[PDB]
Design a protein around this nucleic acid. Structure first.
Ligand SMILES: [K+]
Ligand SMILES: [K+]
Ligand SMILES: [Mg+2]
Ligand SMILES: [Mg+2]
Ligand SMILES: [Mg+2]
Ligand SMILES: [Mg+2]
Ligand SMILES: [Mg+2]
Ligand SMILES: [Mg+2]
Ligand SMILES: [Mg+2]
Ligand SMILES: [Mg+2]
Ligand SMILES: [Mg+2]
Ligand SMILES: [Mg+2]
Ligand SMILES: [Mg+2]
Ligand SMILES: [Mg+2]
Ligand SMILES: [Mg+2]
Lengths: 107, 56, 46, 179, 74
RNA sequence: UAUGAACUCUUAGAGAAAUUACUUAAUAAACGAAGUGAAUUGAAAUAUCUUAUUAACUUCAGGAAAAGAAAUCAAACGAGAUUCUAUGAUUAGUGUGAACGAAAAUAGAGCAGCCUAUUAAAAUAAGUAAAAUGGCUUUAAAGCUGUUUGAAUAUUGUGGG
RNA sequence: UAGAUGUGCAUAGUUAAACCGAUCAUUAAAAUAAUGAAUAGUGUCUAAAGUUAGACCCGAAGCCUGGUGA
C-alpha cells in the first residue's frame, strides 16, 4: 500500500515539475540495475545538463542553456516547496550551491 | 480563392538554403518523438523523496 | 461687402468641384466623405 | 537599372519593381509570368528609396542643428552615403548594377562577394537585403552554380537529393514553339 | 602626434590565384586596396577573399598574412 | 428551432454617386504601432527650457493592437516575463531659472509558459557589440542613430550590465 | 486552526554632513572657556485656506497645424 501512496505523491506535483523530470530523469529514480549512459532520453542526448551551455561539435558555438538563469530559479523555488530539489541537476541557483560557495570562499 | 492564397504565402519555400531546410526537417522528426513518460517504477521512487523530505 | 458670385453659375461646375466622384477618386476627398459620414450628413456632396 | 544580359540564361536580372519581362524573341505561352516569392518582411514603409537598392539597415534620419552659443535647435536630415556601383557576380558572370551604401560595400568584401552576401540566411541579413536584395537572391538561386552548390550541401546535412527549374521551362517553350 | 587620429582602412586580405606580376606569386596572402580587388582582380578571377571560413579550410591562421612584393617577376 | 424573398448606390470598367454597361464584381469611423512633428502658453520680456515624444498628418494591421518569458533589476540578503491602476513621488535627480521628473519596492486586476513554440521558427546569431564624430533621448550610464572604423568564445570566469 | 502580510506620521536632538547622542556643532588637540538648540502625538468630522489643475464669470487682436475654395 505504501507504494500506491508514493505514486500518488509523484502524480500530485505540478505539471511543470513532472514534465521536467520526465525528460531529464536523474540516475537516482532510474531502475536499480540500469546504467545512466544507456537508455538516455532524447532530451538528455541533446544536452546532459539542460541548465549548462553546450558547445555544438559541428559548429564551434556555445548554445544557450535550455532554461535561462531566471527559469532555473523558478524550478528550484518550485522543487524546494515539494521536496524534490535533490532530483534537479547541478545549478548555480541551488540553495546548497549558493551556500557552499559562500562558506568555502566567502566575500 | 484561399488555395491560391496559401500557395502564394508559402511560395518562398523554394528559396530556402540547405541549412534552413535541414533545421525544419529535424523539427518535423522531433515533434514525432513525443514527450517521454514516467514509468510507475520511476514515479514510486519520486514519491519516496517527497515523503522523506516532508515527513522523514 | 458680399458680392453676387453665383450669377451665371452652371450646375456642371457644381458637380466637377463638389461632386461625389471628385471625392471618392481623390485622397483628400475621402476624408470629406468620411468626415461628413461620421457627423451623420445626408448630403455628402453637391 | 539597365542590367546586362546573362551569358547562358534566358532569364534576365529582375527589375527594381520585381517584374521579369522576357524578350519577345523568347516564345512564352499565353498568360505566363515569372512571379518572385514575396519579401518576408515586406517593403519599407519609410524611405522608399531603400526598396530599390542595397541599403543595409540605413535610412534617412532626422535630428537637430544645434547653434554655437544659444544651442538653438533646427530640424535637419542625415542621408546615407548611397552610391551606384557595378558589382561582380560569380554565379551570373556579369556586373550587376545597383545602388549600394559604402557600409554594405564592406560587408560584400567581408563575406566574399555579392553572391555570398545575398545567400545569407540569418534574420539580420534578410532584413538588410530588402525587396531588391531579395530579388537578386531569387535570381542567383536559378543559376546552375548555386543549384549545384546547394545540391552538394544537402548531402553533408544528410538530406535526400532534390521539380522542373524555371530555366528549363523557357527552354521547352523554344522547342514547343517550332512544332 | 595625438591620442586619437583619423580612422583609416588597411585593406582587404586576399589570396592570389593566377600569380599576378608586380604584386605577388600564386597563393600569396596580403592586404590590397579594396578598389583593385573589387573591380580588377575579383571579376577576372585573379584572387579570392580570405574569409574566416576560407582560413579554416586552407588550414592557415590569421598570422599568415604576408606583404606585397613590388619587385616580383614572372 | 428551421425556412421563401430581400431592389439601386457607396462597391467591375467609365461617368456629372444612386446612370451607363456588365456581373452569382462587395468592409466606415473611433481605438493600435511606427514615421514626421508644431504653435498658442508659462518663464510676469525672451533665445536654452517649458507647452510636448502633445495636437495633427502619413503608412501598415487586427477585433483588439502593441509588448512579453531577462545580455532585467538588486547589493553581498534576494527578487524572477509583458500589460493596466495606485502608492513610492510636489522624492533621487536634472535645470541659471520657470519647471521637468524616475526606478527599486509595495498593494490590487490578471497570471502561462516555451523552442516537440498546439502551428509549425534557430544548426544560438559579425560589419554585430563597441569606438571617434554629428544628433536624439537622458543625470555623465544605458538605449536609438547618419558618417568613418571595428572585437571576443562560457563559472576551468569568454561576453554584456 | 494557525502564521504572515499591506504606504504613512510621531516617539531625540545636533550639524553643511556623517560619526556622535541628552547631548551635539565651531574652536585645525581636547577641555561647562564661550554661544545656540530638549518633553503629545495621531485619525476623523465641520469650516476657512496655500499649491497645481480652465480654477470666480464674460471678452481680444493675433500665432501654429490640417483641410476648403479661382
Ligand atoms: K530636487
Ligand atoms: K551612451
Ligand atoms: Mg469681397
Ligand atoms: Mg460668371
Ligand atoms: Mg524615398
Ligand atoms: Mg582609402
Ligand atoms: Mg466603379
Ligand atoms: Mg456598378
Ligand atoms: Mg508610477
Ligand atoms: Mg527672469
Ligand atoms: Mg547568443
Ligand atoms: Mg551601438
Ligand atoms: Mg559601462
Ligand atoms: Mg551594450
Ligand atoms: Mg531625528
Amino acid at each position: 500500500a505504501t507504494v500506491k501512496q508514493h505514486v500518488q505523491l509523484a502524480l500530485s506535483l505540478p505539471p511543470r515539475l513532472r514534465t521536467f523530470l520526465a525528460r531529464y530523469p536523474p540516475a537516482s529514480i532510474l531502475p536499480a540495475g540500469a546504467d545512466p549512459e544507456t537508455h538516455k532520453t532524447p532530451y538528455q542526448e541533446e544536452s546532459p545538463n539542460p541548465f549548462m551551455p553546450t558547445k555544438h561539435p559541428i559548429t564551434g558555438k556555445w548554445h544557450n542553456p535550455k532554461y535561462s538563469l531566471r527559469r532555473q530559479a523558478e524550478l528550484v523555488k518550485l522543487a524546494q516547496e515539494h521536496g524534490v530539489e535533490e532530483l534537479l541537476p547541478f545549478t548555480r541557483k541551488l540553495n546548497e550551491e549558493k551556500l557552499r560557495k559562500r562558506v568555502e570562499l566567502g566575500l | 480563392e484561399e488555395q491560391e492564397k496559401e500557395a502564394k504565402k508559402s511560395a518562398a519555400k523554394a528559396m530556402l538554403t540547405p541549412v534552413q531546410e535541414y533545421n525544419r526537417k529535424q523539427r518535423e522528426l522531433r515533434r514525432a518523438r513525443g514527450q517521454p513518460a514516467l514509468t510507475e517504477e520511476m514515479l514510486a521512487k519520486i514519491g519516496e523523496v517527497v515523503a522523506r523530505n516532508k515527513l522523514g | 461687402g458680399p458680392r453676387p458670385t453665383m450669377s451665371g453659375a452652371t450646375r456642371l461646375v457644381q458637380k466637377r468641384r463638389h461632386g461625389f466622384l471628385s471625392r471618392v477618386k481623390t485622397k483628400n476627398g475621402q476624408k470629406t466623405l468620411k468626415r461628413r459620414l461620421a457627423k451623420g450628413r445626408l448630403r455628402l456632396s453637391a | 537599372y539597365h542590367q546586362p544580359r546573362v551569358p547562358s540564361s534566358a532569364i534576365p536580372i529582375p527589375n527594381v519593381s520585381g517584374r521579369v519581362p522576357l524578350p519577345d524573341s523568347t516564345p512564352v505561352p499565353e498568360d505566363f509570368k515569372i512571379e518572385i516569392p514575396s519579401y518576408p518582411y515586406g517593403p519599407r514603409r519609410v524611405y522608399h528609396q531603400s526598396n530599390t537598392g542595397l541599403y543595409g539597415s540605413a535610412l534617412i534620419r532626422f535630428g537637430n542643428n544645434v547653434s554655437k552659443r544659444n544651442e538653438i535647435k533646427t530640424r535637419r536630415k542625415w542621408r546615407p552615403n548611397v552610391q551606384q556601383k557595378r558589382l561582380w557576380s560569380k554565379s551570373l558572370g556579369v556586373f550587376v548594377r545597383t545602388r549600394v551604401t559604402t557600409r554594405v560595400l564592406r560587408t560584400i568584401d567581408k563575406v566574399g562577394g555579392l553572391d555570398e552576401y545575398l545567400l545569407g540566411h540569418k534574420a539580420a541579413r534578410v532584413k538588410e537585403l530588402g525587396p531588391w536584395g531579395w530579388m537578386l537572391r531569387w535570381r542567383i538561386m536559378q543559376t546552375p552554380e548555386i543549384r549545384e552548390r546547394f545540391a552538394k550541401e544537402r548531402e553533408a546535412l544528410g538530406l535526400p537529393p532534390r521539380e522542373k527549374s524555371l530555366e528549363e521551362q523557357l527552354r521547352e517553350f523554344q522547342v514547343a514553339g517550332i512544332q | 602626434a595625438s591620442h586619437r587620429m583619423r580612422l583609416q582602412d588597411q585593406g582587404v586580405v586576399v589570396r592570389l590565384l593566377e600569380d599576378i606580376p608586380k604584386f605577388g606569386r600564386k597563393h600569396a596572402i596580403f592586404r590590397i586596396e579594396r578598389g583593385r580587388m573589387r573591380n580588377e582582380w575579383f571579376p577576372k578571377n585573379k584572387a579570392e577573399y580570405m574569409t574566416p571560413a576560407r582560413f579554416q579550410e586552407l588550414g592557415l591562421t590569421r598570422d599568415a598574412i604576408g606583404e606585397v612584393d613590388r619587385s616580383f617577376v614572372i
